[PDB]
Write a protein that binds this DNA or RNA. Sequence first.
RNA 1: CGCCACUUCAUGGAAAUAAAUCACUCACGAAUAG
Lengths: 136, 136, 469, 314
Amino acid sequence: MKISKKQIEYAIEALRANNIITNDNQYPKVFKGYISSFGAAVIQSGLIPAIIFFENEDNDANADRHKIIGVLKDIINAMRQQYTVTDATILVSSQIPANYSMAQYIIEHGNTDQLLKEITEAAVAMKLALRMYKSE
Amino acid sequence: MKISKKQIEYAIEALRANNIITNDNQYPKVFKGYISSFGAAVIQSGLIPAIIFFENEDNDANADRHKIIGVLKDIINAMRQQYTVTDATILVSSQIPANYSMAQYIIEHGNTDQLLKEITEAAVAMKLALRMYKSE
Amino acid sequence: MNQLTAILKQHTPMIHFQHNESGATLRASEVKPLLDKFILTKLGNGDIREGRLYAKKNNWLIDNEKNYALNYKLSISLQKKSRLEYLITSSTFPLPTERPSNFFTIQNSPYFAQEKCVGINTNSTIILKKSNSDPRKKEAEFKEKNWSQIDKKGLEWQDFTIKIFSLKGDLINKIQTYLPAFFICHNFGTRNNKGFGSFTVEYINNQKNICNVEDTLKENFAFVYKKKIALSRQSTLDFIYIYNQIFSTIKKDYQILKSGYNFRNEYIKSLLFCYFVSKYPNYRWEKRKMKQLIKARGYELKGDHSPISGIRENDNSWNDPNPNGYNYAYIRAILGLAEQYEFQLETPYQKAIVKIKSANNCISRYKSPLLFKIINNSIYLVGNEINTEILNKPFQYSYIEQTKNKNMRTGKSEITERTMHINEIEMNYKNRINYHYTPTSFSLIDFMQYAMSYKKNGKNILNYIPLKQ
Amino acid sequence: MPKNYTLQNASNLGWLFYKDYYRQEPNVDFISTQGKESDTTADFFRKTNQRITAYQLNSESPLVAAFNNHFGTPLQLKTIYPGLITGSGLPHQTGSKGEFKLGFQFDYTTGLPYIPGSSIKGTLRSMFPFSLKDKGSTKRILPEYRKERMEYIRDLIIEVTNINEISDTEIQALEYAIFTNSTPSGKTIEFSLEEKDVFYDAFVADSKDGVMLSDDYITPHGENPLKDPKPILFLKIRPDVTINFYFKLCTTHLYKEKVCSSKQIEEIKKQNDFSSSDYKMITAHQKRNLFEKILLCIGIGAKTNIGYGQLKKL
RNA sequence: CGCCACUUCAUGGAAAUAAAUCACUCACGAAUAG
């Protein structure tokens, strides 16, 4: 496992797009813990349980916790955008619909290893990209 | 990777400049491990993840681990100076702005081959120059 | 010393959700937080913040910035595993003839949950059955599995151990000082405020504990009220009979407090009602508030006498209050928030239901601000002041009509959701005291200065000896 | 499959609890907000929890017998009823109703509930004086911590072994030899392979007449006493369950204030200068007694301040 | 005495931190020259 600079760029763009990094290049402190907990849940419980937990918006948490799932979808979409025709025959290169539920997308597409690898890549990229910024 | 004396002097000046060596020629003992581990992190994780890890200032580290990234930038900038400027030279003798963090610079300027070589040599110079001082 | 090994006595049975283990005893999950709160309150001489600073200075806190927790280890273990298991309901039913020795029934109790386990349902612990000699006087049968699958049991055990461990000696000394007061002041369990939590500590570190219950109650509570219940002979036999008398008396008195008693033939008005209609005579019942609009359409409710107005006399008014108007607030919210009100329509065939919600989803709960402490068969009623956060907060009332049908090939189906279309009084029908907005200017301390002083012939309705008031 | 967890007919408890727990059935929804609170999801999780808490362990179980053969004789203790909780912080929740919201520690290969040896080591060391590092955020707590722990461990040592006098330096050396297998000041001691304290993984050994796992509730009533509390469901080890504690402990020799190995202590004894007032010994049996007393005092697991994971002798 | 329920189902914190970053030995040996 080695995270590419392109993945970090996608993570930065997605964090800015789903209103996580402010215009002052700062983020709420709880999102680092959110991302670490998501990684731990993914490895321990599974993709479906972790994505279902962090896709919730009725959660009374201290911040908009679904934003990391939105950033995940944005990173995966950007990754699938740069897929080659050689890759498109083996990998599912389709862009994940924006309104579509990420957990529902995973479930309807089985539980393929491709989605798990993409989720793990994007989670580590989110971790590093958040580490690049300051936490106020 | 032979010892480059000029890079050693650059490392000495940068270590003094980024408040690592005290007025009495001593440094926090943990910085030895920081310098030693940075090269391994670059080799076996990637340059961007290693820089992001060592540039973070929200760390639970015994000292200011981010000072080594500033020293690295100072050594790299000193090497960009005294570059033989000619039409055929591959090396970009453009100095890294102080306002830009090191992680952003490699992200925005996507010619990592020069940056990787410079960062590796600067880290070797760092480790070799840290040995002139007391390991308190 | 670094260890505290106390032996404590059980006075009233504990309702325990995890009763399926023979080792079921007091849960330290209730004791430790409440004991920490009590200890810090005593440290600050009545103030929790000052006690927190005290524990902060002496390094007794697990965390010095976030929480109230103190650094010690709580362990509660049973010495002898024999348990006396009780069934706790709200009504009185015929006792079974075949019955395990551990099983006793406290039928008339404040704890009204799990009332359906003494029904005719096949899931009822004691299945009721018609009698053959008399087509009345229901028969009782015991189902072992149903008693095993009950959610909550009332348990009484012998003397058991509470062990307190800490490496901080001064905290242990202060715990030794304050533990008898803590147990004399707090109850643990479900519906513990009504008395299913009563414990006293006998031996602290193999030393008898001479701690006066009256003095500790006087210290830690705003008002303490003693009632000498007539222990008709016995006192050496039938602790079950003693429990039945004690809890029937508690149900009697607490139903007297915030409601009436339309039972057999004797009527005594709600003292919670009588307080508000007397002090600034504008605030009236939420029940009479509710019954007014049900009769606004044709829906005749069972009963012979109209809803009460006025403090006294035998007056009845199923009609307009007066030309000016009347003040309605949720009077019964302060003495325990309620959600759903059944109103008995004339025909059994259907019911009418009123359901209450915060109207902004803020106040979903209120534990009764009264605590019932029973120590060595003596009844003490205690309490601090109410939480002012409940005062002046609105509520939204849902009006539904529910009906049941008699079998027809499947069974009972109490399912009609017609959702009564009563016209609404409107939020802010007056200044924000109309139908909601729990009454302003209440005082619990003066409420019981008022509650047990009432009625003709001079005898107290709640024959309580005022100890602290 | 039903009771009597065996290598032949039984589902892996960890697999059931973590992998098969959140499986997607044709008519079960826990993605949408309606699905998580619906009674269909509650029934699904109730069936899963029944399957989890429907397993027993026999005394003569081949798994536990293999554990005994591999790890030497066990130290058998019993569970009090808060229950026993380990690995509570592991991520296990989706926001659904009727599901276990807390993590549990399951052995991967066997599926039997267990306490990792790291937990045993940390719990045992936590009551030794030098379990706290100086750092600089510890500075204020460090003096008092060491004092109380020194007194406690001193009384325990005088209780368990036939030594009438111990010192702070001797306690420091004993603790560092037991846990770090080194000296308090860095450098190591030439210890034999046998002379090394190993803390194996404690295992569930006997659920006598009932299952080994139960379901329990912690209901944190909020800081606002006027709002609705949160019922939290988790999985605990049942009371009256035999937990086997496996250790590989040796005999510790203390001459003067320093820890000596057997090879050094033989030569020290044979030296013409010797002092029985300076030579102290803690037998592996007395070390096991000390560890057992510590475990009885403080217990093991999570929520131990609430009481979870306390033991008596079997 | 007769009847009867509705509620609530995870948040906050820690997300790695220090030690060792190569060490020792060999760094040319013979033959051919004189």
